[PDB]
From a paper:
In Gram-negative bacteria, the full Dpp transporter is composed of five subunits: two integral membrane proteins (DppB and DppC) that form a translocation pathway for substrates; two ATPases (DppD and DppF) that bind and hydrolyze ATP during transport and a periplasm-localized SBP (DppA) for substrate capture. The Dpp transporter is primarily responsible for importing dipeptides but also capable of inefficiently importing tri- and tetrapeptides into the cell. Different from those structurally and mechanistically well-characterized ABC exporters that solely consist of two variable transmembrane domains (TMDs) and two highly conserved nucleotide-binding domains (NBDs), the ABC peptide importers require an additional substrate-binding protein (SBP) that captures peptide substrates and delivers them to the translocator for function. Unlike the reported heterotrimeric Mycobacterium tuberculosis DppBCD translocator, the E. coli DppBCDF translocator is a heterotetramer, with a [4Fe-4S] cluster at the C-terminus of each ATPase subunit.
To achieve this, we mutated Glu179 (E179) of DppD and Glu187 (E187) of DppF, two key catalytic residues for ATP hydrolysis, into glutamine residues (DppDE179Q and DppFE187Q). These mutations prevent ATP hydrolysis without affecting ATP binding. By incubating the inert ATP analogs, AMPPNP or ATPγS, and Mg2+ with the complex for 30 min in ice prior to cryo-EM sample preparation, we determined the ATPγS (or AMPPNP)-bound structures of the mutant DppBCDE179QFE187Q. Structures reveal that both ATPγS-DppBCDF and AMPPNP-DppBCDF adopt an inward-facing conformation, nearly identical to that of apo-DppBCDF. The RMSD between the ATPγS-DppBCDF and apo-DppBCDF is only 0.27 Å for 1,112 aligned Cα atoms. Intriguingly, although sequence alignment and structure superposition indicate that DppD, similar to DppF, does possess functional ATP binding-and-hydrolysis motifs, ATP analogues are only bound with DppF but not DppD in both ATPγS-DppBCDF and AMPPNP-DppBCDF. In DppBCDF and ATPγS (or AMPPNP)-DppBCDF, the periplasmic scoop motif region in DppB is invisible due to its conformational flexibility without interacting partner. In this state, binding of a single ATP molecule to DppF in DppBCDF does not induce conformational changes, and DppBCDF does not consume intracellular ATP.
Numbering used by the authors:
A (entry chain A): 2 to 32, 62 to 336
B (entry chain D): 9 to 334
C (entry chain B): 17 to 298
D (entry chain C): 3 to 325
The structure:
Amino acid sequence: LQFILRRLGLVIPTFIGITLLTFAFVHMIPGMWQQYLHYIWGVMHGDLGISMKSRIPVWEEFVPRFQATLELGVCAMIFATAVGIPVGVLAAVKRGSIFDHTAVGLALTGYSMPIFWWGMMLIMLVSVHWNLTPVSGRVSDMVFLDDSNPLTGFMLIDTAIWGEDGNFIDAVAHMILPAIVLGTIPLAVIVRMTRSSMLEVLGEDYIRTARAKGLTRMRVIIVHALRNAMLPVVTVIGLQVGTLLAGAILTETIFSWPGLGRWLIDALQRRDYPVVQGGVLLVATMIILVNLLVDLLYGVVNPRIR
Amino acid sequence: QQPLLQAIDLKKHYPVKKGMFAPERLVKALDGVSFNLERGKTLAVVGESGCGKSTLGRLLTMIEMPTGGELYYQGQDLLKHDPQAQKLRRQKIQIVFQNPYGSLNPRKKVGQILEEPLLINTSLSKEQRREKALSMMAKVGLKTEHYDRYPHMFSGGQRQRIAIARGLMLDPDVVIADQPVSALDVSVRAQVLNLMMDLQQELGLSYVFISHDLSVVEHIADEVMVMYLGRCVEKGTKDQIFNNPRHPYTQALLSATPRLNPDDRRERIKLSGELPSPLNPPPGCAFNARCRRRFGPCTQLQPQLKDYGGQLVACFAVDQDENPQR
Amino acid sequence: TPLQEFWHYFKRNKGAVVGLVYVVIVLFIAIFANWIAPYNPAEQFRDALLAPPAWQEGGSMAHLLGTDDVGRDVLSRLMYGARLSLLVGCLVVVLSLIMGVILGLIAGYFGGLVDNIIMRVVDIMLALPSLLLALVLVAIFGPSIGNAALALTFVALPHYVRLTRAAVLVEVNRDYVTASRVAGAGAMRQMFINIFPNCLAPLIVQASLGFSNAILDMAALGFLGMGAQPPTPEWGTMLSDVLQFAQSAWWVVTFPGLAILLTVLAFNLMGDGLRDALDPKL
Amino acid sequence: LLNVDKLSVHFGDESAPFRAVDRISYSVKQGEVVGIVGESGSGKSVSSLAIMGLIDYPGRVMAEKLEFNGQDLQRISEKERRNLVGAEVAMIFQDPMTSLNPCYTVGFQIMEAIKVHQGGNKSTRRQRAIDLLNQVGIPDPASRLDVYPHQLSGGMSQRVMIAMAIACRPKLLIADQPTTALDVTIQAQIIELLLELQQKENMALVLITHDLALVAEAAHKIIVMYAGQVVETGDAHAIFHAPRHPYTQALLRALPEFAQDKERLASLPGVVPGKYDRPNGCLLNPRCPYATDRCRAEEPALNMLADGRQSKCHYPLDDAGRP
Ligand SMILES: Nc1ncnc2c1ncn2[C@@H]1O[C@H](COP(=O)(O)OP(=O)(O)OP(O)(O)=S)[C@@H](O)[C@H]1O
Ligand code: SF4
Ligand code: SF4
């Protein structure tokens, strides 16, 4: 109980602050107490505003963007977690090898990467010179789905369950470059943190006890070290998931992706403040719920808290 | 004549949360400690971890305010909210900490560390502060060339020497020493103890010597105060407490202390259990869970310090041994 | 002496010395751009429109890294861009470091209501991604190089506040801060003369990550049009609306991004050198 | 049982190594208690981690002989070392709080130790773990299987380490300062536990500690370490009534037990020699009150004396305390 209650007691003051600053933005930049109550009452009924170019409600624009951003963010974080964790463990276990110097070297290069430029380079190499993978969009303009079906709005699900033959490998081919491009800073940070964490843990007194019990080197690494070295990792993961939208504004623009970052930056370039004002509230909201989820996850894995 | 320092009924309770905001328990880290300290004498405070000896040290050097009781220096009160009392508090009572590695600022030179007290509290010029600091270094056994060096350039003994030298800069007459020789080697330990006895005999200092090592206390002390669960359980001169211990915890603590000479190895009495947590203190006498002499009143009441032949003990079994009608 | 001990350990990281050599070279190119750059960064050579680098068949030594889609020389634009990139990064890091250290000492030393007010404001302005909050402020206040730099200065304060406040709470519990309080030291002396010299090791490394982030985020703002304006030689601005050249003129897409990546990598290499030298790690 | 000969442990570059242990030799019989006494920088703990194979990548170990139970620990395989470590030789370490893995319960950590060597089903293993927690004196062994290490005291943490070390009934137990971190009563409890296990299971015990008085109560034989070298060996009563090395004599005169009420304690000048400071001849040359030009030229042998003791000195002391 008490750990959850202690963290909710910091989330609520933050959510009140986000709501007060969004009310200040909506009052000061047009497209006290009674007006604040009227504003948050409207937001709770879904009245986030009307988008100036389309005249569609901001929530009815948002839902497709959130799905198409979450699908991309999931794939990018799958790439980063799957590839990054094994490499950081091997780098710490093989300290000073050609593998360690290459893993540290490539991670430092990814952590310093201008995301928008590197996606232009992969369009130029993979899509223009080698011609392996499509340059633009979420699925090929060949692909269309009967709207009669209970389509989820996630293309990797929808084109598998209700798609024609050969449409699913199209929905995957369009996903590869956006997921690698968005996943690169997360991958670099997961390699860096997994390595430093593992070298910290491999130097602890309980690893000397694990060796002194006669345990195999693989069991000392996977059972004893990695369970402890994962706690820090969890944190960073949480951090990066919040930062993925930053990378998505840059990534979605070059790949012409339907998405929440492209919708926001087009609104900021238009001065379409109804989309910006509703959008920063929903984005803010998601971040603090994600943060809360992560910290509940950390307090479940961590016995010191549990 | 008033004693140099006098503590009457000192207390320190820290409020704590039982995993919930409402229940408001008190951690009775210290309650009912009282003593008189004379000029040129060592009072040793002895006990195991959790006994209140370090919070007593922090109260006496005024790092923390007490929850109750009185603290007098030469007959005037040190617990007042009064800017005139600062001139007693900072000059006359001083502290030497346990850890030589954490008690010196690692980004200051030794000259800076010793001159900071004089810069804050005194009117001395830059030349006069350096002359006084170099004289204190020479008194404490550091070299004139050490004045430019940072704490990480010194051994644990040389760091405890800088810490003693800093403590003496304002010309004190009470020094509180919180486990001052615990981390040090045998040789370095010896070195350090010889220095503290030389400084007492030269300058007239009185020590409040907080210690876990009874071997060192049998050497440096004049009076010994034995602590259990925030209360004093036995108090008396060194010869009384080491040659005639009357309280069961003092007998157990001396019987558990290892001794090199075979003839001085006392009868082994071995206690059960852990020292109890101060969040959930035992009812009546705090030692009744571990004691070999448990008796009718011990679970019902706290005992009080009484004079039994010139030493004070807080024990109902000693009261019945001296008063058979009890 | 501790500065020679720091330099001795910094020299042990060979990558960090390679980073420092590049930063000195780019700073020299940034200072002397007026004299080194072969042409003015806005001058148009319309007889040599979309001319390739000097090592390709349509090119000449007159334009080493080629020309853009209006005939401007790319080399000169890259080094006047190096000048803007370093001046913005320096202004962002210095202002965010000064204001963040003071608010973090004031939070970590005094505690109580001051720590709660400061840390709730910091947690509110971290409720958005750094770049999204900078974009919103520059879109409220209009896009310009100055506006972008002030937005980047503001959104960076949380990291310096949170790091300094975290370091100060690790020092304030120690016996040397307590011994200084028993000796009579006031709050100003405790913060700036005693605790701050011990917090400075974390901050010297964080300033290198700050330079890297200010360069990446200024280039991101410039790419998205919400930064330096189109005539200016800023590296992200040179990558705004260039993707149609990926087939016909690879040099326009390539070299501004290598200038960013190379510069950020040099500050990140140097930063892990500062980490190896200032921590008791080796 | 254990037979160490010419053992050396080095750190740093081979042109100028830090000789943390330097041509030491000692033997342990089954059922013997051996104390290893020394100050800071003596190499005492390092000599024991070199038996366990716990010296890591920047360090080196070499010996003329390093037999345990008839097997040469220099040339056995990695698998064969794991069949000794925990099963025939076991170790307990200096800090109770850091030495148990904080992510796993006490029962997982003991049942894992039993599994690695003895095997058996879950039930069997759990039974043997309850048996061990009862044997080391835990007040409720069934509930203490389910606690995490941060819920234990220092005393209970060290009892769990002893239960986990003795789980396979080893022939040798090494105790590297097992009680330095603990209160005096808890120290007395843990060392009377170790000596009860030692006598009941007919097990060899190596006590590594700086406390001379604690070893004088516990040990049969004492080995005195200085600057990475053994300087004296002998029976625990004889060694401190009549010391045969000037170092041991100095060491005793520095104890506050060894003096009248408030007379000054003796102490040697100087500091223990590190990598750069190391003297020629005898390593006590800068400090020894009896130093002579022979001592400055020759490294002294570990001289075998008439009563069966050894001291690493050119002039082994008489019973009055003179060369
Ligand atoms: N801030 C605090 N809040 C609550 N309890 C405290 C606090 N500070 C100390 N205590 C308790 O005070 C009790 C009495 O002993 P202490 O004053 O801490 O000294 P001590 O433990 O005997 O000596 P130590 O171990 O060498 S610091 C301990 O059991 C602590 O848990
Ligand atoms: S009062 Fe009772 S419990 Fe306390 S020491 Fe005396 S006999 Fe033991
Ligand atoms: S050999 Fe010489 S210097 Fe060494 S301990 Fe003996 S008398 Fe002293």
